[PDB]
Ligand binder design. Structure first.
Ligand code: ZN
Lengths: 375, 116, 333, 111, 225
RNA sequence: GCAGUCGCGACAUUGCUAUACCGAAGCAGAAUUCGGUAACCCUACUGAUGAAUGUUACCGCAAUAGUAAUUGAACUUAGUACGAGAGGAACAGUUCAUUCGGAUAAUUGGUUUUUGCGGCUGUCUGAUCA
C-alpha cells in the first residue's frame, strides 16, 4: 500500500456519532403493522453502526502485518497494546449488535447508544491517532534510501534541504525535529530518498530513528563537528558512534565532519567508513560529499541541415492563415478560387498553358458541320 | 466540396444526397440514388443494363471517347491559382459542353443508320 | 407534453401575431422591429465552419434551411399606444388613405358581392388641404411615446392562390418619437424591402402556426435563436449564387418547390426549420435581447445551395445538367 | 449495434467475437464492455473494453456526407485506448480514428 | 534539442504533427502552446503549416513525405491539396497517391535517403516514392512489426525503433541504413514510437510524459548535440 | 430494562445484558465527513358549436390560467497554485454528448392503394401485344 493515508474514515466522538445515527434513522423512515414498523425501525439503526465500524477497521492499517518497521514506528508513536485493545473494542461493538413493541425498540436503541457511549474512550483514541497517522512520512523501504544521522542538528539539515527540495527546519536549538523527515530526488535517472534523524544521544524521538535505521535498508552518513558547534564533546560523539557501531556499521556508513586532529582521525578504525571534512555553509565540499553519497549506494547521402537553423535563438477567436501561406504576391492572396463551375469541379478541367488546347477548337467547331454529322 | 461520379451510372452526385457504401476493400461505392445502389448490390451490371452511360458508351449508343471527355483528367497535382487559367477554363468549358452535347446527337444519328 | 404549451386548443387564427417587441432606446435611429413572410418550402445548404475551438473547425458542414418569400411590405397606417394603469390603449390610428384592393378584400369577407365602398368618405380628409392628419400627428407627438406602424404584404406578387393581403403591426426603435412620426410621415404609402432592416448572420426569432396532424397540432409556436443566412432580392442577379460555386441560378429548385410556386422574388434564408408548412405566413422578430454569444456573433460563408428537384428524388441540380448529361433524346429530336 | 448483441472483431489479437454486457445503443467509436467466446484463454471468458470501428448503419458525417460501412467490427482496448492489437484489418471510421489516436495509428486503412 | 510537448493533454505527437528538415506540419487546435513550441524550436528556419489532411486530426499518421517531396494520401481533398500547395514553397514537390491502404504515415517510414515501406505497399507506390523523394525502397518488417511507419522513426543522424526489436534485426537495419539505430520506449513505455514522437536531422519532439531514461536514449541515438 | 451513586428528586452517573449554495474537521491539492437553505356512472378530462352586445370586419391591449429545461464530457486557466512524491484545483470564455419539451421532411429511412412503372404468373380473349 502507498505510504500516505488520507482515505481513513474520520472518527467522531461517541456522542456525536450516536446523535448522527439517531438523526439519520429518524429521518429515513393494526398489531401486525405496528410490529413490522417497529422491527424495521430497530433494524435500520444497527446498520449504520456496523457500516461505520467496518469502514474504520478497513481504513486503519494492521500494525503487525504491513511491515516490521511500520509496526515499530506505530508502537513507538502510540502504545501498540492500547491500539490493539481499541481495535478489539471496535470489533466487539460491531459484533455485539403496541406499547411492548415501543419498549423493545427503545431497548434496542438505548443498548446501541450505551455501547457507543462506552466506546467513547476507544473512539477518542482512534480520532487522535488518525489525526497524526494519515500524513506520516512516505518512507519506501524498497527504494534507494540514504539516512543522515548523528547528534542534534549541527546544521546538517541544510545539506538535506540542498540535496532534496523538501524544506526542513534548520533552527539550531536543542532538538530541531521530533519525527522522520524525508525528501525525494533523482540521480543518474534513478530515484533516491533522503531521511533525516532528529538526533541520537532513551527517548521515543531517538528510538524511532534507531528503529528506522535498523529495519530499513539504507546508506548512512554520521555527522560530527570539529568546530565549536554541536555542543557535545568529540569524545562523547566518538563513544556514541562506537557504542552504536555493532548494529549500524553494516549500513554503508560514511562520516561527515563539519591533539584535536588525532582525536578526530582516531575514528578511522572502522574499516568501511570514509571521512569527509566539510561545513554546513560552504559549497565545494558539500557538493563533493553529495556526489560521494550518491555514488556510494551504487558502489555498495550525409545529413542535411539548413544553415538558418544555427542562427535561430528562440479558442474563442479564429485565426487566419493569410500572410502565413505563401503565394507569388500579397495583393492576390485572397482565396477567390470558385472550385466549382456549372456542376463540374474546377480542377477537373483546369490545367496550365491550356491556351494551346484552346487552339484545337478552331478546327473542332468546323468538324461539327463539315464532318457530315448534320447539315 | 466534391461531386462524385456514380459507380453504377457515372452521373454526377453532390454531397448530402444518397448513401455511400464502404466495403472492406475500402473503395468509394458512391451512387446517385438508392435505386442505383440496390441495382449495384443485386449486380445488375451497368455494362449490360440499357439505361446507363457505362453501357451506352461501350455499345456505341453514345460517344465513347472524345476530346471533350479526355480532358476530364484526375490531376495528381494542383495549380498556382492564376487568373488567366480561370478565365481560359471559363471560356473553354461551356464550348466543350456544347460540342459534347452536339456530338451526342451526332453519334445518335450515326447509330441511326437505316432511318437517317 | 410540457404544460407550458397547453391547452391544446386550435390557434385563434392562421396569421400568428407577435406578442412582444424588442426593448427600445431613446437615442438610436428609427428601425423596424419585425418583418413578415411566407414559408416557400425548404432546402439544403453546405457551408464552411470557421467556428474556433470546434471539433470540425475550418471544415465543411451540411444543414437544412427554410426559405421564406418576403416581398416588399407596404405601409398603410400608424397607431399610437398610451400606457395606463390598465395596460396599453390604442389612442389614435391614422392611415395612409392609399388602401389597396387587397386590403379591401381582406376587410370584406365576400368581396365578390360587396359594393367596395370601404374607405371612400375617409379619403376626403386626405384628398384636400386637410390639416386633420397634421393635428392627429401633433396629438401623437405630445402623447404616448410608443408607436406602431401598420403594413401589408404584396400578396399579388407572391405566387399564392389566397390573393388576400394581411395586416401586421411593426414597432419602431427610433428615439424622440417626434422623429418616429416624422419618418412615418415621409414613408407613408411607401414600400420597404427586406434588406433595409435585417443583415447577414444576424440572430432573430420566428413565429408561425404549426401544421395540423388531426385536435393534433394547429397551434402558434415560436422558435428562437435562428441565424440569417442570405437575403435574396428579385433585382439581385443570381440570388442562389455563392462565393465558391457562384452559379448563376436562383434558389428555386428544378420544377420549383413542392406544393408551392417557383419563387423568383425577394426571400430570406435562415438557419433551422421555422415552424409552419408551405404557404404558411410567419413573422420574424429581431432578437428582443442583444445576445452576445459566439454562436450569434459568428458569421457564415455560403459554399453551395441545393437546387435539385424535391418531388421524388433529385437527379440533377439545374436544367442544364440533365440535358447535358443526356446528350440527345427522342423527346428533343 | 443493439445493447447486449454479439458482433465480430477486427483486431489481430487472440479474439474474434465479442458479446456486449454493458454500454458506456451502440455506434461507430462507442465503447462497451464485452466478453469473448471464439478465441483463446488470453481474452476468452474475461470481460474487456471494446471500441466500435464500424457501424454498418447509415449516418451523416459532419463533413457533409451520408455513409455506411459493410460489417460491424470492433477492437479490444483498455478504457484509456491502449489497444493490444498491433494492427486492425479493414477500414476504420474517421470519428473513431480522431477520437482514439492509437486506433488510428494501428489502423491499416482509415475511411 | 529534444523538446517535450502535448496536444489536448496527449503525447501522440506523431499523430497530431509531422516534421521534416525543410518544413513542419501541425493539426488544427485551440491550444496556442502547441504552435508556440514549434515556432520556438524552428521559427524562421522552416515553415510550420497549420492544416489538416482529409479533414482528420491524425495528420501525423496520414502524412508521408520528406524534405524532397510530399505524397499525400487519396483522402486528401482538392481544397486541402490546393491549401498545402499554397502553404509550401515550389521547392517541395506535392503529389496525391491513389491507394487502397492510403494510411501512408503508418504504412511508410522514410527519411531523406531511405524509405521503409510495409510489404503490403504496391510496386507503383514504391516506385513513385523512390522517384519523387529520391530515396531507396526498403520493404522491411522490423522484428516482425507490421506498421513500420508507426513503430519506427528514422532521421539522417539516427533511428529509433520499438523496444521489442531484436538485436540482430537492429544491427542489420542500421548497417543497411548506414546510420545507428536504437530500440526504446517513448511517452513512459509507449511502444508506438512513430506515433508518439517525431524527429528530424536537428530537432526531436516527444511527449511531456517521456521518462528521463527514454529522453536520454533518444538524445544519445539521434546525436542532436 | 433492573439496580446505585445524587420526604418527595432535574441533567449527568456505575454495575449486567440527487444536484447547487454556506461554516467547520489537521480543509497542503483532489476526494471525504459533519450542521442549515429541502428536492346508459355524479364531479369528470379535453377538442369544439353556440341566442346578445346597433350590424359586419381589421388592428390591438390584457384580467385571469399554465410555464422548463435538466445531467454529463474536452480545452483554456494546468500539469500552475498546491505537494516530501504519487497526484492535482477552481473561477472568466469557448466546443460537445444524453433525457425531456417545441417544430420540419431539405437528405436518409421502417412503410405503399403513385391503387406508377416493366416482366412474370392465376385466367382467357380469332391465335400473338395485353
Ligand atoms: Zn446511379
Amino acid at each position: 500500500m502507498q505510504l500516505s493515508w488520507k482515505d481513513i474514515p474520520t472518527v467522531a466522538p461517541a456522542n456525536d456519532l450516536l446523535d448522527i445515527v439517531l438523526n439519520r434513522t429518524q429521518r429515513k423512515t393494526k398489531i401486525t403493522r405496528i410490529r413490522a414498523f417497529y422491527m424495521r425501525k430497530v433494524k435500520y439503526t444497527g446498520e449504520g453502526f456496523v457500516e461505520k465500524f467496518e469502514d474504520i477497521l478497513k481504513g486503519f492499517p494492521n500494525i503487525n502485518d504491513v511491515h516490521p518497521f511500520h509496526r515499530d514506528l506505530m508502537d513507538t508513536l502510540y502504545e501498540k497494546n492500547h491500539y490493539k485493545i481499541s481495535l478489539a473494542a471496535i470489533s466487539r461493538a460491531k459484533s455485539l449488535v403496541l406499547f411492548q413493541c415501543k419498549q423493545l425498540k427503545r431497548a434496542a436503541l438505548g443498548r446501541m447508544a450505551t455501547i457507543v457511549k462506552k466506546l467513547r474512550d476507544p473512539l477518542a483514541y482512534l480520532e487522535q491517532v488518525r489525526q497524526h497517522i494519515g500524513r506520516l512520512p512516505s518512507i519506501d523501504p524498497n527504494t534507494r534510501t540514504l539516512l543522515i544521522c548523528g547528534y542534534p542538528n549541527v546544521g546538517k539539515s541544510s545539506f538535506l534541504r540542498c540535496i532534496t527540495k523538501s524544506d526542513v527546519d534548520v533552527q539550531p536549538y536543542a532538538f530541531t525535529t521530533k519525527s522522520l523527515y524525508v525528501g525525494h530526488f533523482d540521480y543518474k535517472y534513478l530515484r533516491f530518498q533522503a531521511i533525516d534523524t532528529p538526533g541520537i544521544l532513551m527517548n521515543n524521538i531517538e528510538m524511532q530513528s534507531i528503529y528506522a535505521i535498523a529495519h530499513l535498508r539504507s546508506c548512512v552518513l554520521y555527522f560530527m563537528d570539529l568546530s565549536e558547534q554541536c555542543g557535545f564533546t568529540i569524545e562523547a560523539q566518538v563513544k556514541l558512534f562506537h557504542s552504536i557501531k555493532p548494529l549500524f556499521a553494516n549500513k554503508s556508513v560514511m562520516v561527515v565532519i563539519n591533539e584535536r586532529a588525532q582525536l578526530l582521525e582516531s575514528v578511522k578504525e572502522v574499516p568501511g567508513v570514509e571521512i569527509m571534512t566539510s561545513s554546513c555553509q560552504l559549497e565545494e565540499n558539500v557538493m563533493e560529499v553529495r556526489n560521494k553519497a550518491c555514488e556510494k549506494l551504487l558502489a555498495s547521402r550525409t545529413p542535411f541541415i539548413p544553415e538558418s537553423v544555427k542562427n535561430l535563438k528562440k479558442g474563442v477567436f479564429n485565426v487566419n492563415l493569410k500572410d502565413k501561406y505563401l503565394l507569388e504576391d500579397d495583393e492576390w492572396k485572397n482565396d477567390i478560387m470558385p472550385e466549382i463551375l456549372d456542376g463540374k469541379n474546377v480542377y477537373d478541367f483546369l490545367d496550365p498553358e491550356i491556351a494551346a488546347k484552346l487552339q484545337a477548337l478552331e478546327e473542332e467547331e468546323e468538324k461539327l458541320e463539315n464532318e457530315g454529322f448534320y447539315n | 466540396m466534391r461531386i462524385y461520379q456514380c459507380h453504377f451510372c457515372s452521373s454526377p452526385c453532390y454531397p448530402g444526397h444518397g448513401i455511400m457504401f464502404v466495403r472492406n476493400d475500402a473503395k468509394e461505392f458512391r451512387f446517385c440514388r438508392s435505386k442505383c445502389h440496390k441495382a449495384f448490390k443485386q449486380r445488375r451490371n451497368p455494362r449490360k443494363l440499357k439505361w446507363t452511360k457505362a453501357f451506352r458508351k461501350a455499345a456505341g449508343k453514345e460517344l465513347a471517347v472524345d476530346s471533350t471527355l479526355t480532358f476530364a483528367q484526375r490531376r495528381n497535382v494542383p495549380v498556382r491559382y492564376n487568373r488567366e487559367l480561370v478565365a481560359t477554363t471559363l471560356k473553354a468549358m461551356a464550348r466543350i459542353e456544347e460540342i459534347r452535347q452536339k456530338r451526342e446527337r451526332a453519334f445518335y444519328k450515326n447509330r441511326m443508320r437505316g432511318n437517317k | 407534453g410540457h404544460l407550458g404549451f397547453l391547452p391544446r386548443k386550435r390557434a385563434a387564427s392562421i396569421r400568428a401575431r407577435v406578442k412582444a417587441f424588442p426593448k427600445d432606446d431613446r437615442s438610436k435611429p428609427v428601425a423596424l422591429t419585425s418583418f413578415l413572410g411566407y414559408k416557400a418550402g425548404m432546402t439544403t445548404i453546405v457551408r464552411d465552419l470557421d467556428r474556433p475551438g470546434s471539433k470540425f473547425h475550418k471544415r465543411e458542414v451540411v444543414e437544412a434551411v427554410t426559405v421564406v418569400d418576403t416581398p416588399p411590405v407596404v405601409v398603410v397606417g400608424v397607431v399610437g399606444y398610451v400606457e395606463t394603469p390598465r395596460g396599453l390603449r390604442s389612442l389614435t390610428t391614422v392611415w395612409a388613405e392609399h388602401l389597396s384592393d387587397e386590403v379591401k378584400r381582406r376587410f370584406y369577407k365576400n368581396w365578390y358581392k360587396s359594393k367596395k365602398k370601404a374607405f371612400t368618405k375617409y379619403s376626403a380628409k386626405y384628398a384636400q388641404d386637410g390639416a386633420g392628419i397634421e393635428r392627429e400627428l401633433a396629438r401623437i407627438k405630445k402623447y404616448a411615446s410608443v408607436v406602431r406602424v401598420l403594413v401589408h404584404t404584396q400578396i399579388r406578387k407572391t405566387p399564392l392562390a389566397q390573393k388576400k393581403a394581411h395586416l401586421a403591426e411593426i414597432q419602431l426603435n427610433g428615439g424622440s418619437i417626434s422623429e418616429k412620426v416624422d419618418w412615418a410621415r415621409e414613408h407613408f404609402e411607401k414600400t420597404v424591402a427586406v434588406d433595409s432592416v435585417f443583415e447577414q448572420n444576424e440572430m432573430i426569432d420566428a413565429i408561425a402556426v404549426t401544421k395540423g396532424h388531426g385536435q393534433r397540432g394547429y397551434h402558434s409556436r415560436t422558435s428562437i435563436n435562428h441565424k440569417i443566412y442570405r437575403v435574396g432580392k428579385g433585382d439581385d442577379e443570381a440570388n442562389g449564387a455563392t462565393s465558391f460555386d457562384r452559379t448563376k441560378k436562383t434558389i428555386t429548385p428544378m420544377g420549383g418547390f413542392v406544393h408551392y410556386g417557383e419563387i423568383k422574388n425577394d426571400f430570406i434564408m435562415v438557419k433551422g426549420c421555422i415552424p409552419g408548412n408551405r404557404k404558411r405566413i410567419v413573422t420574424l422578430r429581431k432578437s428582443l435581447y442583444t445576445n452576445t454569444s459566439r454562436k450569434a456573433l459568428e458569421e457564415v460563408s455560403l459554399k453551395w445551395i441545393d437546387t435539385a428537384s424535391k418531388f421524388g428524388k433529385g437527379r440533377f441540380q439545374t436544367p442544364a445538367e440533365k440535358h447535358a448529361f443526356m446528350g440527345t433524346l427522342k423527346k428533343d429530336l | 449495434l443493439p445493447v447486449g448483441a454479439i458482433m465480430n472483431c477486427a483486431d489481430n489479437s487472440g479474439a474474434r467475437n465479442l458479446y456486449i454486457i454493458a454500454v458506456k445503443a451502440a455506434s461507430l467509436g462507442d465503447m462497451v464492455m464485452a466478453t469473448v467466446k471464439k478465441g483463446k484463454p488470453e481474452l476468452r471468458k474475461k470481460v474487456m473494453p471494446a471500441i466500435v470501428v464500424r457501424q454498418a448503419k447509415s449516418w451523416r458525417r459532419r463533413d457533409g456526407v451520408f455513409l455506411y460501412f459493410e460489417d460491424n467490427a470492433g477492437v479490444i482496448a483498455n478504457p484509456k485506448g491502449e489497444m493490444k492489437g498491433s494492427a486492425i484489418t479493414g477500414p476504420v471510421g474517421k470519428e473513431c480514428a480522431d477520437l482514439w489516436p492509437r486506433v488510428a495509428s494501428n489502423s491499416g486503412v482509415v475511411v | 534539442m529534444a523538446t517535450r510537448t502535448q496536444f489536448e493533454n496527449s503525447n501522440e505527437i506523431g499523430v497530431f504533427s509531422k516534421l521534416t528538415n525543410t518544413y513542419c506540419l501541425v493539426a488544427v487546435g485551440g491550444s496556442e502552446n502547441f504552435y508556440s513550441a514549434f515556432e520556438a524550436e524552428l521559427g524562421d528556419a522552416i515553415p510550420i503549416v497549420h492544416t489538416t489532411i482529409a479533414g482528420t486530426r491524425i495528420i501525423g499518421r496520414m502524412t508521408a513525405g520528406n524534405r524532397r517531396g510530399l505524397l499525400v494520401p487519396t483522402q486528401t481533398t482538392d481544397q486541402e491539396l490546393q491549401h498545402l500547395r499554397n502553404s509550401l514553397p515550389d521547392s517541395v514537390k506535392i503529389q496525391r497517391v491513389e491507394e487502397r491502404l492510403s494510411a501512408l504515415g503508418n504504412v511508410i517510414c522514410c527519411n531523406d535517403y531511405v524509405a521503409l515501406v510495409h510489404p503490403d505497399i504496391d510496386r507503383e507506390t514504391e516506385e513513385l516514392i523512390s522517384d519523387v523523394l529520391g530515396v531507396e525502397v526498403f520493404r522491411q518488417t522490423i522484428s516482425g512489426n507490421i506498421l513500420v511507419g508507426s513503430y519506427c522513426s528514422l532521421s539522417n543522424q539516427g533511428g529509433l525503433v520499438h523496444p521489442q526489436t531484436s538485436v540482430q534485426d537492429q544491427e542489420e537495419l542500421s548497417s543497411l541504413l548506414q546510420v545507428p539505430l536504437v530500440a526504446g520506449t517513448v511517452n513512459r513505455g509507449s511502444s508506438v514510437v512513430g506515433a508518439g514522437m517525431v524527429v528530424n536531422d536537428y530537432l526531436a519532439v516527444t511527449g511531456l510524459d517521456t521518462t528521463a531514461p527514454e529522453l536520454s536514449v533518444i538524445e544519445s541515438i539521434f546525436r542532436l548535440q
